Amino acid sequence: AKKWVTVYYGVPVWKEATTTLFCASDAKAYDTEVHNVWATHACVPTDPNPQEIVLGNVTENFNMWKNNMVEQMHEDIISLWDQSLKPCVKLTPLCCNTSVITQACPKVSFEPIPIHYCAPAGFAILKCNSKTFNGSGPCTNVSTVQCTHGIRPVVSTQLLLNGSLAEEEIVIRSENITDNAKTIIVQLNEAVEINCTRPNNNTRKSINIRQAHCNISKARWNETLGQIVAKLEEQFPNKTIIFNHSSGGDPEIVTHSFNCGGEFFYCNTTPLFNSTWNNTRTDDYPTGGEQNITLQCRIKQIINMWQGVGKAMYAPPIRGQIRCSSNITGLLLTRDGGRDQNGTETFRPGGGNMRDNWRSELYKYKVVKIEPLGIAPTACKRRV
Amino acid sequence: AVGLGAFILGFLGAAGSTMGAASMALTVQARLLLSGIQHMLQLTVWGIKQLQARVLAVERYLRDQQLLGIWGCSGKIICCTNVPWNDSWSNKTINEIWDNMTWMQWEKEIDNYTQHIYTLLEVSQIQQEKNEQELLE
Amino acid sequence: AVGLGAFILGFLGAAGSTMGAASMALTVQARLLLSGIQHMLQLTVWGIKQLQARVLAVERYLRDQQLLGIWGCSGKIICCTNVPWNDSWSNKTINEIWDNMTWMQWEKEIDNYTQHIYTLLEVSQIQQEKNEQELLE
Amino acid sequence: AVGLGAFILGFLGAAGSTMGAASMALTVQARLLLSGIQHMLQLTVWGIKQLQARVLAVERYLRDQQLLGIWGCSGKIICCTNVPWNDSWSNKTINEIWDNMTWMQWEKEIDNYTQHIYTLLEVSQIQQEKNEQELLE
Amino acid sequence: KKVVLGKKGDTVELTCTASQKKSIQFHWKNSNQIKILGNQGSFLTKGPSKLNDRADSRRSLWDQGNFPLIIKNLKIEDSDTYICEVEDQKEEVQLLV
Numbered sequence A: 001a002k003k004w005v006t007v008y009y010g011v012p013v014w015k016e017a018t019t020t021l022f023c024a025s026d027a028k029a030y031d032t033e034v035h036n037v038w039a040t041h042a043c044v045p046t047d048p049n050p051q052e053i054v055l056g057n058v059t060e061n062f063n064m065w066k067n068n069m070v071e072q073m074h075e076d077i078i079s080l081w082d083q084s085l086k087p088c089v090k091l092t093p094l095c096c097n098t099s100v101i102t103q104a105c106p107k108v109s110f111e112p113i114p115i116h117y118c119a120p121a122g123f124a125i126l127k128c129n130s131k132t133f134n135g136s137g138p139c140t141n142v143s144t145v146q147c148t149h150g151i152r153p154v155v156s157t158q159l160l161l162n163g164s165l166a167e168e169e170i171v172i173r174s175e176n177i178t179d180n181a182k183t184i185i186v187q188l189n190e191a192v193e194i195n196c197t198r199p200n201n202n203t204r205k206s207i208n209i210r211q212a213h214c215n216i217s218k219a220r221w222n223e224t225l226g227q228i229v230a231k232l233e234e235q236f237p238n239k240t241i242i243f244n245h246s247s248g249g250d251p252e253i254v255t256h257s258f259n260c261g262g263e264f265f266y267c268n269t270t271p272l273f274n275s276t277w278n279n280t281r282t283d284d285y286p287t288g289g290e291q292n293i294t295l296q297c298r299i300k301q302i303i304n305m306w307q308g309v310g311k312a313m314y315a316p317p318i319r320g321q322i323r324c325s326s327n328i329t330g331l332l333l334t335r336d337g338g339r340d341q342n343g344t345e346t347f348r349p350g351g352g353n354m355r356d357n358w359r360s361e362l363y364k365y366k367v368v369k370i371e372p373l374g375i376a377p378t379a380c381k382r383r384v
Numbered sequence B, C, D: 001a002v003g004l005g006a007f008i009l010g011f012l013g014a015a016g017s018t019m020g021a022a023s024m025a026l027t028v029q030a031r032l033l034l035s036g037i038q039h040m041l042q043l044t045v046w047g048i049k050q051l052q053a054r055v056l057a058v059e060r061y062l063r064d065q066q067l068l069g070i071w072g073c074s075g076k077i078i079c080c081t082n083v084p085w086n087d088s089w090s091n092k093t094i095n096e097i098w099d100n101m102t103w104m105q106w107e108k109e110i111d112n113y114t115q116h117i118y119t120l121l122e123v124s125q126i127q128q129e130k131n132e133q134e135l136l137e
Numbered sequence E: 001k002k003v004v005l006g007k008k009g010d011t012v013e014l015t016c017t018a019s020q021k022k023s024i025q026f027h028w029k030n031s032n033q034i035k036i037l038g039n040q041g042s043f044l045t046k047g048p049s050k051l052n053d054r055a056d057s058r059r060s061l062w063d064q065g066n067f068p069l070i071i072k073n074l075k076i077e078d079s080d081t082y083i084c085e086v087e088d089q090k091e092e093v094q095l096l097v
């Protein structure tokens, strides 16, 4: 009638763990392009027959802002870039003198390959399959996989490109939606195409070639904001939603940015974020009939690096045509709060922290280890 | 079987099942098991990765089966000891725990005591060995 | 050894040997074992196939060694139970079976009773466990 | 653990440690383990070679664990028997052997007697089995 | 609060610190919770503040666990409580002009 201690082995219990993940990708390895070359000696071929097992009635606490899978992706991408898109001059502080590297800038083809992260033997990845998962709550539909979906390592600010879309609705995720010091990641359930180009007809100016433009469907952009606003309205029900331009700081934050080949496209996004929303409908995007929002873009040679503090110079632009066709799949917004915000909330483009870009894709995954040895009370006794 | 829980070393049951239900399911499956009633490089690469996972699980299994001898539980999936539950570790009854909780919830309920309990189990085994050798004289 | 029978899980003897002869041969070989006294792609492919067969046999072996605990025979190659033979299952004597029959012939002789016998073995183990826990009070 | 000795089946300790020291170290490590507290063809080739070594060690381990049942020591890393030391095999005391010698030195000290001892162990087990079955009547 | 007094026309360096030296996100806000400066990745950002054309930071020190806010050309209107947010901890310094 006494309760006795019983040791059980093979108990289906797991704990959070941090291990080194490996990767896989559909690299071709003969295209000379940077990601295919990197992937050739970094990642393995993908799993020809991946499997996923749904765990019935399992509730798991996920937290996208404490996810160590992010750190590994961050480090792999930095190495990918440093081994490829080499600047002519790399200038960094050393504390505080400067360390300077001078080296060649060959031009290379540069286009992302989706990379799958895979658990090593002894580890497994839990995936949250809820379509409404907000990044930090419990997930009630959890499955086990070895590998993640492939993620293209697109490096950008303000607007997240490519990667993936939400299943049903725009989902707004923030560690603390009210502290004004977190990037709000807005995942869209529909992509908005952005077409950027410099169509081989440029000249040079001196005393241009560094001039390009991007076309955004007007109808899709305005519809997209209306849906974002509806979700923001629910979060902030008595306030006006204002989309404004960026607040200042380094050009990589102030303007959008992306990289095609060696072209860094700093683009003025003011035309996308200049409006005041009343409930879910407004003006400030007049129905002129053009149906094309155009951004002015520049190609720069001296840029601030995203992988650390410092500046770097890249060789001047390609004389032919540059074409990029991307999917806007999400936004990085920050809030303008404060004691004097008398009935309004202002949202501005943010980003610059490449970890936020990677959290927007890795938020559904958690790495765990199995701990099969457990103890529970019983009614049996050992004979002694 | 061995695939329960959707993983090797998930042997005793599905995650999400109660502790009690998992035990009953295990017994039924054990009876059934004893009654007895397209080519690419990536196949090589993943074949090796799959074998490494399986070999490792076997090595860990065998190691733990011998390590548990330190508490007098070697060679077992389910053991039984002579250490009293001590009440304070958990105020729930046998039926409350086994009928309503799953294994993860249970471990969360008592993970502030498992290092203490492991120590007590070792001490009991030492005393049992000592007593037996004293009797054999 | 483990290659007897020309297969893994053919451990107890050569196919075609009598049951008795196989047992004696096994004992002799066990004593000897303890006394202790060209590159092509297909090598990769078949190396993996061979490992898969070996890993699988080990996993099955270990699983069955634990499943048999349901009859009180865990961790054993040769067990011993307290269930009477019941005569009707086979009218042959111990020497007739062990000296003249091989294992396949024997299984053919009694395969109309093994599901019945398996049930009886489980029942005996349950009663044995119950009795021991009743005594320990 | 299992990597002690720098090899599989070096389980009981580092080569060069004394027999006594190795035993103590093993106990400590066992407690810790239970408390729980770049792509080229040659990767394929060596991945297979590594798996073959690991699979083989497991198969040998399991085989020996069952073969030792012939002396009444199946399923064990450390056994205990009822065969007297007989003095002449080694004139050293328990402390002299365990405190100062390593395992290789010890085997060198008595390798003229191990075939004799193995025979004695088998004989004792046979007599023990016989006695138990005679008692059970 | 730490109190630092400057004078109209001067430059003042106010600081936040960390025990960890590198890759630390921090923000500076005023007493009305308006952002002035902050670190996004490796980049310096500015908030919607009256100090945007005067506030700056020595980026080279960020990997030393030192995250200064520098206000150039101080005015009497800048006297306030400045709040550091570094990692999990907060710090407050009062600036008088």
Ligand SMILES: *[C@@H]1O[C@H](CO)[C@@H](O[C@@H]2O[C@H](CO)[C@@H](O[C@@H]3O[C@H](CO)[C@@H](O)[C@H](O[C@H]4O[C@H](CO)[C@@H](O)[C@H](O)[C@@H]4O[C@H]4O[C@H](CO)[C@@H](O)[C@H](O)[C@@H]4O)[C@@H]3O)[C@H](O)[C@H]2NC(C)=O)[C@H](O)[C@H]1NC(C)=O
Binding pocket: A107, A108, A109, A110, A111, A112, A154, A161, A162, A200, A258, A259, A260, A261, A262, A318, A319, A320, A321, A322, A323, A324, A325, A326, A327
């Ligand atoms: C989101 O995903 C999409 C697709 O899923 C990505 O879009 C791709 O972006 C790349 C970047 O440009 C683009 O690649 C070009 O395709 C052209 C089709 O034939 C190629 O001709 C071109 O190669 C030339 O330009 C490269 C520039 O660095 C050179 O390195 C290369 O050697 C070639 O250069 C020769 O030709 C040019 C012609 O003007 C000449 O000037 C040079 O001197 C030289 O002679 C690129 O391969 C893809 O086609 C895009 N895909 C699609 C469907 O459009 C998108 O970028 C992702 N988003 C982000 C932000 O990454």
Ligand SMILES: *[C@@H]1O[C@H](CO)[C@@H](O[C@@H]2O[C@H](CO)[C@@H](O[C@@H]3O[C@H](CO)[C@@H](O)[C@H](O)[C@@H]3O)[C@H](O)[C@H]2NC(C)=O)[C@H](O)[C@H]1NC(C)=O
Binding pocket: A195, A215, A289, A290, A291, A292
């Ligand atoms: C909004 O911007 C888009 C650009 O993304 C405009 O679409 C482009 O419109 C031009 C108009 O001439 C199309 O040119 C056509 O190209 C085909 C190619 O073979 C050619 O045969 C035709 O004679 C003509 O030159 C261009 O293809 C088209 N771009 C795409 C991707 O379809 C769009 O028209 C702009 N909207 C408005 C209202 O202007």
Ligand SMILES: CCCCCCCCCCCCO[C@@H]1O[C@H](CO)[C@@H](O[C@H]2O[C@H](CO)[C@@H](O)[C@H](O)[C@H]2O)[C@H](O)[C@H]1O
Binding pocket: B059, B062, B063, B066, B067, B069, B070, B074, B129, D001, D002, D008, D009, D011, D026, D027, D030, D057, D058, D061, D076, D077, D078, D079, D080
């Ligand atoms: C190919 C890889 C295969 C896996 C190999 C795993 C090897 C790991 C060995 C771990 C040993 C743990 O540590 C040791 O375990 C044995 C297990 O009986 C215990 O031994 C205990 O049981 C045995 C048999 O019941 C008794 O003879 C002994 O008197 C008793 O103390 C020791 O008291 C303990 O110190």
Ligand SMILES: CCCCCCCCCCCCO[C@@H]1O[C@H](CO)[C@@H](O[C@H]2O[C@H](CO)[C@@H](O)[C@H](O)[C@H]2O)[C@H](O)[C@H]1O
Binding pocket: A010, A380, B001, B002, B008, B009, B011, B026, B027, B030, B057, B058, B061, B076, B077, B078, B079, B080, C059, C062, C063, C066, C067, C069, C070, C074, C129
């Ligand atoms: C890496 C892969 C390794 C292979 C893993 C194989 C796992 C398969 C587990 C099958 C479990 C079968 O089912 C269970 O077995 C244990 C085995 O002791 C039995 O347990 C029985 O023996 C133990 C120890 O002797 C006692 O503590 C228990 O009181 C008694 O009932 C259970 O009564 C039975 O329900």
Ligand SMILES: CCCCCCCCCCCCO[C@@H]1O[C@H](CO)[C@@H](O[C@H]2O[C@H](CO)[C@@H](O)[C@H](O)[C@H]2O)[C@H](O)[C@H]1O
Binding pocket: C001, C002, C008, C009, C011, C026, C027, C030, C057, C058, C061, C076, C077, C078, C079, C080, D059, D062, D063, D066, D067, D069, D070, D074, D129
């Ligand atoms: C996938 C590969 C896995 C590895 C497989 C290894 C198989 C090797 C089998 C070797 C058998 C050695 O030989 C045999 O062992 C068993 C082990 O209990 C001994 O059996 C002894 O123990 C058992 C259980 O304690 C009793 O039921 C039996 O009465 C007693 O004699 C036999 O007396 C001996 O003849």
Ligand SMILES: *[C@@H]1O[C@H](CO)[C@@H](O[C@@H]2O[C@H](CO)[C@@H](O)[C@H](O)[C@H]2NC(C)=O)[C@H](O)[C@H]1NC(C)=O
Binding pocket: A052, A053, A054, A129, A130, A141, A142, A143
């Ligand atoms: C939990 O998530 C899984 C994964 O999306 C859902 O199962 C999928 O359901 C679709 C429906 O057509 C199938 O096509 C998929 O093959 C299923 N996937 C798997 C892995 O089984 C599942 O239904 C979700 N469960 C709940 C309760 O929402």
Ligand SMILES: *[C@@H]1O[C@H](CO)[C@@H](O[C@@H]2O[C@H](CO)[C@@H](O)[C@H](O)[C@H]2NC(C)=O)[C@H](O)[C@H]1NC(C)=O
Binding pocket: A134, A135, A136, A137, A138, A173, A174, A175, A176
């Ligand atoms: C995600 O949703 C969960 C709810 O499913 C939120 O967690 C709740 O937060 C409120 C805030 O006071 C608490 O009172 C609840 O108890 C929390 N519930 C649970 C189950 O923890 C969570 O904060 C949301 N996360 C995000 C990033 O928005």
Ligand SMILES: *[C@@H]1O[C@H](CO)[C@@H](O[C@@H]2O[C@H](CO)[C@@H](O)[C@H](O)[C@H]2NC(C)=O)[C@H](O)[C@H]1NC(C)=O
Binding pocket: A176, A177, A178, A179
């Ligand atoms: C989210 O951010 C808000 C704003 O900083 C936190 O709430 C503040 O908590 C401090 C703690 O002393 C209070 O003094 C403030 O008055 C609070 N502000 C408001 C507006 O209530 C909030 O706790 C944060 N939430 C989480 C989960 O960290």
Ligand SMILES: *[C@@H]1O[C@H](CO)[C@@H](O[C@@H]2O[C@H](CO)[C@@H](O)[C@H](O)[C@H]2NC(C)=O)[C@H](O)[C@H]1NC(C)=O
Binding pocket: A195, A197, A214, A215, A290, A292, A293, A294
């Ligand atoms: C991006 O959009 C602009 C318009 O906003 C496009 O320029 C127009 O193209 C049509 C096509 O015949 C011309 O008739 C218009 O006069 C152009 N407008 C101007 C102001 O010049 C531009 O071509 C689009 N970009 C791409 C790549 O097609």
Ligand SMILES: *[C@@H]1O[C@H](CO)[C@@H](O[C@@H]2O[C@H](CO)[C@@H](O)[C@H](O)[C@H]2NC(C)=O)[C@H](O)[C@H]1NC(C)=O
Binding pocket: A193, A194, A195, A215, A216, A217, A325
């Ligand atoms: C960017 O270019 C793509 C094509 O590369 C445009 O998509 C095409 O738009 C025309 C417009 O009628 C459709 O008929 C085509 O079927 C579309 N192609 C595909 C593959 O869907 C896209 O609209 C361009 N973006 C913008 C903003 O104009």
Ligand SMILES: *[C@@H]1O[C@H](CO)[C@@H](O[C@@H]2O[C@H](CO)[C@@H](O)[C@H](O)[C@H]2NC(C)=O)[C@H](O)[C@H]1NC(C)=O
Binding pocket: A242, A243, A244, A245, A274, A275, A276, E048
């Ligand atoms: C976008 O943000 C800017 C910066 O705060 C706003 O501009 C300020 O508007 C107030 C309104 O009285 C002026 O007093 C400030 O001087 C303006 N700042 C600057 C630098 O001129 C701007 O109005 C915001 N846009 C929207 C749509 O609200």
Ligand SMILES: *[C@@H]1O[C@H](CO)[C@@H](O[C@@H]2O[C@H](CO)[C@@H](O)[C@H](O)[C@H]2NC(C)=O)[C@H](O)[C@H]1NC(C)=O
Binding pocket: A254, A255, A268, A269, A270
């Ligand atoms: C983005 O483009 C807009 C133009 O649409 C720039 O805004 C202009 O900045 C000049 C600077 O003195 C002002 O005089 C104009 O009145 C502004 N125009 C409007 C419509 O406000 C804007 O600065 C550009 N932003 C970036 C980051 O380049």
Ligand SMILES: *[C@@H]1O[C@H](CO)[C@@H](O[C@@H]2O[C@H](CO)[C@@H](O)[C@H](O)[C@H]2NC(C)=O)[C@H](O)[C@H]1NC(C)=O
Binding pocket: A218, A270, A271, A272, A274, A275, A284, A285, A286, A287, A288, A289, A290, A291, A292, A293, A294
């Ligand atoms: C916000 O930016 C948009 C970018 O399109 C501005 O829209 C243009 O406004 C001018 C004003 O005469 C029109 O001629 C253009 O045709 C509009 N563009 C399009 C694509 O229709 C918009 O006016 C700006 N809003 C505010 C409040 O300044």
Ligand SMILES: *[C@@H]1O[C@H](CO)[C@@H](O)[C@H](O)[C@H]1NC(C)=O
Binding pocket: A238, A239, A240, A241, A277, A278, A279
């Ligand atoms: C919509 O406009 C009316 C006009 O007075 C204003 O009162 C109301 O607050 C506005 N709502 C939003 C969300 O801007």
Ligand SMILES: *[C@@H]1O[C@H](CO)[C@@H](O)[C@H](O)[C@H]1NC(C)=O
Binding pocket: A219, A222, A223, A281, A282, A283, A284, A285, A286, A287
């Ligand atoms: C979005 O486009 C539709 C097209 O008719 C227009 O009516 C609506 O007002 C637009 N939204 C904004 C914010 O202008």
Ligand SMILES: *[C@@H]1O[C@H](CO)[C@@H](O)[C@H](O)[C@H]1NC(C)=O
Binding pocket: A162, A191, A325, A326, A327
């Ligand atoms: C944008 O999303 C659509 C959705 O199917 C996809 O087909 C298209 O290829 C995507 N574009 C890019 C650039 O990935």
